[PDB]
Write a protein that binds this ligand. Structure first.
Ligand code: UV4
Ligand code: K
Ligand code: K
Ligand code: ZN
Length: 398
């Protein structure tokens, strides 16, 4: 079956941040308005038997002092008076500031995404679901002891950690506009989690990594060659983006043969995202790069975790993720999902004005070098990890 993470409290928590507002509610209500929920198995967010069990789950990746600091930040923001200078300095030392501010629910909000993605991972492990979707998750920037890019807790690293420790290999695929640095870094020394991020990179653009460093770094120790990156120039469309990553996806699957796939599907590559950097769509006839990638990944028939991420045009993120959700049901259950080109009436209908259609409102050799580089890296990866692959069969894809 296809699972999806939601619950009433979950919804409230995912909608309590100053940066992403009610986006999750738009997403889940658009999915509901298109009658997709009856097709889906609800996956309840994980809860724990005690504070100690919660901490040992979260400190599987994050340091105890960082988790303490985040929890204290929440408490401090549930009080009237300003932070002391000592508290400011403490928060600064974990980058809990600037673009990662405190707010009254910052800990519960962050933890919620972890609860969802851990429950999603468990539903895959026990084989209750073939695919699980968590649109409240996908926070790929958070580090062991540092908030970054409005990511406070890295639900992806924790979910992946549960998957590998269940021999097991995980392929992580990061489609967000931004480099998934936090996930990449977490598994930098681990060959069993192969990470692949496609993203914009350019001087001064956040977070700075996932590109020429001059050479391409790609893992260390036994994890050498296990971190893959494809940095792309601004302005790329659905077709060029698809052609850029399609051969890479297929070759990674063939060579790695992952036991699980985890996909971060941040929607900030949409042409209508305020970043205005890539020109991807949610079109399903030209064809959305997102839907192309997901369809390709689901065709592998590997247990899969699909996560959200970036996406700052909320109704258009809803439009895309509603389509990813329908496509997942169709590919997994083999049952056609017809989605009306018009937005159905529902609680958030007015947010989709003024045209109220499902399509986003938009009218549409460097890469060849990157493919050779990535092919060579995949070869070094296989060599280092003694994996058997048809070098030709892989080379033909490109
Ligand atoms: O995956 N990471 C992100 O999505 C991310 C991280 C940092 C900054 C930003 N940028 C913004 O928050 C933003 C919001 C509105 C308009 C322009 C940029 C995005
Ligand atoms: K990415
Ligand atoms: K790795
Ligand atoms: Zn992003």
């Amino acid at each position: 079956s296809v699972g999806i993470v939601y619950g009433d409290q979950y919804r409230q928590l995912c909608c309590s941040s100053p940066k992403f507002g009610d986006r999750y509610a738009l997403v889940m209500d658009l999915i509901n308005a298109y009658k997709l929920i009856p097709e889906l198995s609800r996956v309840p967010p994980l809860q724990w038997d005690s504070p100690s069990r919660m901490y040992e789950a979260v400190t599987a990746f994050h340091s105890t002092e960082y988790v303490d600091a985040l929890k204290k930040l929440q408490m401090l923001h549930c009080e009237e008076k300003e932070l002391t200078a000592d508290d400011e300095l403490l928060m600064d030392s974990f980058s809990l500031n600037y673009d990662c501010p405190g707010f009254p629910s910052v800990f519960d909000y962050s933890l919620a995404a972890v609860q969802g993605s851990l429950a999603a991972a468990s539903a895959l492990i026990c084989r209750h679901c073939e695919v699980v979707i968590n649109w409240g998750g996908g926070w790929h920037h958070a580090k062991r002891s540092e908030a970054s890019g409005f990511c406070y807790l890295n639900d992806i690293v924790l979910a992946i950690h549960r998957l590998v420790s269940s021999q097991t290999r995980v392929l992580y695929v990061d489609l967000d506009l931004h480099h998934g640095d936090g996930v990449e870094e977490a598994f930098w020394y681990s060959p069993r989690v192969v990470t692949f991020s496609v993203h914009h990179a350019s001087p001064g653009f956040f977070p700075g990594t996932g590109t020429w460093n001059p050479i391409f770094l790609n893992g260390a120790g036994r994890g050498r060659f296990s971190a893959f990156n494809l940095p792309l120039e601004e302005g790329i469309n659905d077709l060029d983006w698809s052609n850029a990553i399609g051969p890479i996806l297929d070759s990674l699957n063939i060579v790695i043969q992952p036991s699980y796939v985890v996909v971060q599907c941040g929607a900030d590559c949409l042409a209508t995202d305020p970043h205005r950097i890539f020109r991807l769509t949610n079109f399903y006839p030209s064809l959305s790069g997102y839907l192309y990638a997901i369809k390709k990944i689901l065709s592998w028939k590997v247990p899969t975790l699909i996560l959200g991420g970036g996406g700052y045009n909320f109704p258009d993120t809803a439009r895309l993720w509603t389509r990813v959700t329908a496509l997942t049901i169709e590919e997994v259950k083999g049952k056609k999902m017809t989605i009306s080109p018009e937005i159905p009436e529902h609680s958030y209908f007015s947010r989709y004005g003024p045209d109220f259609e499902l399509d986003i409102d938009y009218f549409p050799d460097s890469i060849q070098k990157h493919h050779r580089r990535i092919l060579e890296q995949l070869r070094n990866y296989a060599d280092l990890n003694k994996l058997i692959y048809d070098y030709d069969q892989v080379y033909q894809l490109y």
